[PDB]
Design a binder for this molecule. Structure first.
Ligand SMILES: [Zn+2]
Ligand SMILES: [Zn+2]
Length: 373
C-alpha cells in the first residue's frame, strides 16, 4: 500500500453548503489544507487514503474572520489589574473563528506591536490564520520599524494600522497626523501586497466620524481603506456610519456591544438603509473580558430573530471581511481557497471546525489547543 497521507485528503459529503452562497447539498474535497473541489456527489474514492466525513443533515459554511481581537490581551483602563489575558486558540476555534486580525487598544505602554506580532505568528503555527494592525489608539503610531508605512510594507503579518478618534482615550490627533498615518498604511500596503487599511476605534464624541471626513478632505487615501469600528456604540454615530457606508465606505459593527444598537440590529439597519452586505463587517473586540460567543450568536439572531437567510447572515463574518482586507483564499468555499470550514446543525450550532484542512473542533469542543492551554 502506497502512502498518500501527506495530502491529508478529506471529503466532506452530504452537507447543505453555504459558501456563503447557498449551494444546496454539495460535497467539498480537501487536500493540503486547500479546497480542491466543490461539487455534488464527489466519489468517495476519487482520491486515495481519503478521510470521508458524513455531513448529511448538517450545514457547511466558511470559517469566521474576526478582524478586531486583542490577541495578546488588552484592557488596563482601570489600572494594571484590568489588563486582560492573551487569547487562547481554543476560544477562537470553538467560536468558529479560523482567521483573525489582532490589534492593540488604549494601552500601548505595557502592550507592544512586537508582542502582537509574535502571538499572531504563534496562532499561525498552531493552525489558524492571523494578521495584525500596527499602531494602537495613540497617534502618531507606535510602530515596529519606526514608520507606519514601513511596518505595513515589510512586516509580513501587518496589513494596516489602527488608531482612535472621537474618544476620551484618544491622543487628540489632528487631521495631518491622521491623514499621514492613513496614507502611510495605504502606500505601505501597495508595497507589501497588504490591503493597507486604517481602522478607527470610534468613541462617543459628538464629532463622531468628522475626523475621517476631514482626513478625506486632506489626502487621497481611498474611502475603501478607512474602517470605522464600534459604530453601534451610540445612535448618532451609527447613523453617520450608515451614511459613510452609503458613500462607498465599509463599516465594522462590534458584536460585543448590545446597546444602544445590538450587532444583529445594526446589520439589519444597514440592509434596511440599502447598504450592500459587502460593506458591512462584524468583529468581536475579543479579549478587550469580551469573548467570541457573540459572533455566532449574531448570525443565529439574524436568521432566527430577524429574517436574514443563512447566506446573508454569514457575509459580515466571512466574504465581507475577506473582501475588505483582501484576504486571498478566505471567506468563501471555492476550489483553490483555504479549507477553513465550519460544520453546524440546522440550528447553526457549531459541531466541527476545520482550519486549513485540519480538524480543530470535533463535538463543539476544541481537540486542538494552544501549547499552554
Ligand atoms: Zn476599540
Ligand atoms: Zn479593540
Amino acid at each position: 500500500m502506497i502512502d498518500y497521507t501527506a495530502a491529508g485528503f478529506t471529503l466532506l459529503q452530504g452537507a447543505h453548503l453555504y459558501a456563503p452562497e447557498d449551494r444546496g447539498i454539495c460535497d467539498v474535497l480537501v487536500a493540503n489544507g486547500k479546497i480542491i473541489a466543490v461539487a455534488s456527489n464527489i466519489p468517495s474514492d476519487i482520491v486515495p487514503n481519503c478521510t470521508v466525513v458524513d455531513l448529511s443533515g448538517q450545514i457547511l459554511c466558511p470559517g469566521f474572520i474576526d478582524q478586531h481581537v486583542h490577541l495578546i490581551g488588552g484592557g488596563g483602563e482601570a489600572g494594571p489589574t484590568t489588563r486582560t489575558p492573551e487569547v487562547a486558540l481554543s476560544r477562537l476555534t470553538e467560536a468558529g473563528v479560523t482567521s483573525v486580525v489582532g490589534l492593540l487598544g488604549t494601552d500601548s505602554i505595557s502592550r507592544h506591536p512586537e508582542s502582537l506580532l509574535a502571538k499572531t505568528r504563534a496562532l499561525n503555527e498552531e493552525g489558524i490564520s492571523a494578521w495584525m494592525l500596527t499602531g494602537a489608539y495613540h497617534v502618531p503610531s507606535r510602530t515596529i520599524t519606526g514608520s507606519v508605512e514601513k511596518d505595513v510594507a515589510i512586516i509580513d503579518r501587518v496589513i494596516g494600522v489602527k488608531c482612535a478618534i472621537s474618544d476620551h482615550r484618544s491622543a487628540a490627533p489632528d487631521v495631518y497626523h491622521l491623514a499621514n498615518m492613513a496614507a502611510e498604511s495605504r502606500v505601505g500596503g501597495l508595497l507589501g501586497g497588504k490591503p493597507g487599511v486604517t481602522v478607527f476605534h470610534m468613541g462617543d464624541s459628538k464629532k463622531a466620524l468628522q475626523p475621517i471626513y476631514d482626513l478625506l478632505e486632506n489626502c487621497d487615501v481611498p474611502i475603501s481603506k478607512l474602517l470605522p469600528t464600534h459604530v453601534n456604540r451610540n445612535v448618532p454615530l451609527f447613523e453617520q456610519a450608515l451614511e459613510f457606508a452609503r458613500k462607498g465606505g465599509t463599516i465594522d459593527i462590534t458584536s460585543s456591544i448590545d446597546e444602544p444598537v445590538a450587532p444583529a440590529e445594526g446589520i439589519a439597519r444597514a440592509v434596511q438603509a440599502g447598504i450592500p452586505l459587502a460593506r458591512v463587517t462584524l468583529s468581536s473586540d475579543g479579549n478587550g473580558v469580551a469573548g467570541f460567543e457573540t459572533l455566532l450568536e449574531t448570525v443565529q439572531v439574524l436568521v432566527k430573530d430577524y429574517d436574514f437567510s443563512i447566506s446573508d447572515a454569514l457575509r459580515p463574518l466571512t466574504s465581507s471581511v475577506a473582501g475588505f482586507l483582501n484576504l486571498t483564499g478566505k471567506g468563501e468555499i471555492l476550489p483553490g481557497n483555504d479549507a477553513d470550514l465550519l460544520v453546524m446543525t440546522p440550528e447553526l450550532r457549531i459541531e466541527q471546525v476545520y482550519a486549513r484542512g485540519k480538524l480543530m473542533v470535533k463535538d463543539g469542543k476544541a481537540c486542538v489547543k494552544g501549547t499552554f492551554e
